[PDB]
């Protein structure tokens, strides 16, 4: 049952900045979870792909909890942009309702 | 960009018990998170399938990192079963590398 990863999830703020991001991220992309925290992840978008990718976080965020899927390169860092089918969400406190942050599932296509 | 869900994902300890599930899961089974959350999801498996979901969470935690997958039917809130594809691996404190978590993506095939 042992899968090679092609997907990981990654936690963002409001922003696009990564505040979370799971290991398989070494094997899809290329790079340590500590390579990508406290960056946006718009800094590994293919610089055509950046308005569809702002676009989903801009939008992801006026409807909390609502599910977009997005596809775009990212930048590995063995310097190959990889198509990427990012689904994004809101992830709503249980207690007040208000956004704690957006879960992007990445997987590479 | 909007898109339906059929995947979600949930936290889970070492013994299969519902730790965290994301609100997809409504659109995905059914249930709200409140009505998984502290179940084991062996209790939601086919009875036929519950071996494979049992090796596959004896696994994971065996060699910690691995993510592997596994299908087997879920039942629905609509009492109906539904196949579901999951990968599951497990999430590694960052300064120790002891088990923190299992990482579950349910995805409905």
Request: charged letters at 20%; aromatic letters at 12%; a negative charge.
């Amino acid at each position: 049952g042992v899968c090679q990863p092609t997907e990981f999830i990654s936690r963002h703020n409001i922003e696009g900045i990564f505040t979370f991001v799971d290991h398989r991220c070494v094997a899809t992309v290329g790079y340590q979870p500590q390579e990508l925290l406290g960056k946006n992840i718009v800094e590994f978008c293919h610089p055509e792909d950046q308005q569809l990718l702002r676009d989903s976080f801009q939008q992801v965020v006026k409807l909390k909890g609502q599910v977009l899927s997005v596809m775009f390169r990212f930048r590995s860092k063995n310097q190959e942009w990889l198509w990427m089918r990012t689904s994004s969400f809101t992830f709503q406190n249980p207690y007040s309702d208000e956004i704690e942050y957006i879960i992007c599932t990445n997987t590479n296509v």
